[PDB]
Design an enzyme around this catalytic site. Structure first.
Site, PDB file in Angstrom:
ATOM      1  CD  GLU A  78      -3.159  -0.622   0.059  1.00 44.07           C
ATOM      2  OE1 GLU A  78      -3.120   0.501  -0.482  1.00 44.07           O
ATOM      3  OE2 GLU A  78      -4.023  -1.474  -0.239  1.00 44.07           O
ATOM      4  CB  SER A 110     -11.716   9.835  -1.757  1.00 49.97           C
ATOM      5  OG  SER A 110     -11.458   8.746  -2.617  1.00 49.97           O
ATOM      6  CG  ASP A 166     -13.665   8.518  -5.111  1.00 44.90           C
ATOM      7  OD1 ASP A 166     -12.590   9.055  -4.775  1.00 44.90           O
ATOM      8  OD2 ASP A 166     -14.184   7.590  -4.452  1.00 44.90           O
ATOM      9  CG  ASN A 173      -8.599   6.907  -4.082  1.00 39.87           C
ATOM     10  OD1 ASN A 173      -8.918   7.043  -2.901  1.00 39.87           O
ATOM     11  ND2 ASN A 173      -7.666   6.056  -4.481  1.00 39.87           N
ATOM     12  CG  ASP A 196     -16.014  -2.609   7.046  1.00 41.11           C
ATOM     13  OD1 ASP A 196     -15.710  -3.751   6.625  1.00 41.11           O
ATOM     14  OD2 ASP A 196     -15.864  -1.580   6.349  1.00 41.11           O
ATOM     15  CG  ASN A 201     -11.004   6.412   0.309  1.00 40.68           C
ATOM     16  OD1 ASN A 201     -12.192   6.681   0.361  1.00 40.68           O
ATOM     17  ND2 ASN A 201     -10.230   6.798  -0.688  1.00 40.68           N
ATOM     18  CG  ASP A 258      -6.541   5.674  -0.821  1.00 39.83           C
ATOM     19  OD1 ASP A 258      -7.695   6.009  -0.520  1.00 39.83           O
ATOM     20  OD2 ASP A 258      -6.307   4.787  -1.664  1.00 39.83           O
TER      21      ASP A 258
END
Ligand code: CL
Ligand code: CL
Ligand code: NA
Length: 129
Positions: free
Chosen positions: A35, A50, A48, A46, A101, A59, A52
């Site tokens: 990562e 957003s 969209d 990213n 989650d 994110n 990271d």
């Protein structure tokens, strides 16, 4: 801060990640390697809009507030810059929420594509834990 492999394994073990929700330490080290290349200051934008952040590339659409991802949530209740610290505590505590989650470590695309189903114990081989 750019961690060494064993240095990060030891830091993650101290913060409770070894076998957290059933994921052995090697999974977490493998994910951090691909990562962020073990760099706490890594950021990536990213598509969209957003971004990271940090050693586990958490994110901003869901988990932290960076003041520029409109309509995003802040489920970890932290500014995204906290995830870039040399102290990995904030990143680890937020990662524990993500992995809990429902989707496990599949939340991390690099883990899914480069660690899942491999010999992840190799990532902690030779370290003093
Ligand atoms: Cl392991
Ligand atoms: Cl799981
Ligand atoms: Na956010």
């Amino acid at each position: 801060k750019v961690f060494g492999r064993c240095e990060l394994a030891a830091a993650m073990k101290r913060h409770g990640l070894d076998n957290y929700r059933g994921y052995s330490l090697g999974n977490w080290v493998c994910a951090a390697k691909f990562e962020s290349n073990f760099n706490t200051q890594a950021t990536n934008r990213n598509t969209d809009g957003s971004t990271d952040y940090g050693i586990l590339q958490i994110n901003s659409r869901w988990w932290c507030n960076d003041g520029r991802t409109p309509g995003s949530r802040n489920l970890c209740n932290i500014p995204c810059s906290a995830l870039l610290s040399s102290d990995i505590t904030a990143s680890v505590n937020c990662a524990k929420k993500i992995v809990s989650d429902g989707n496990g470590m599949n939340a991390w695309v690099a883990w899914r594509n480069r660690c899942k189903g491999t010999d992840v114990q190799a990532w902690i081989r030779g370290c003093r834990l």
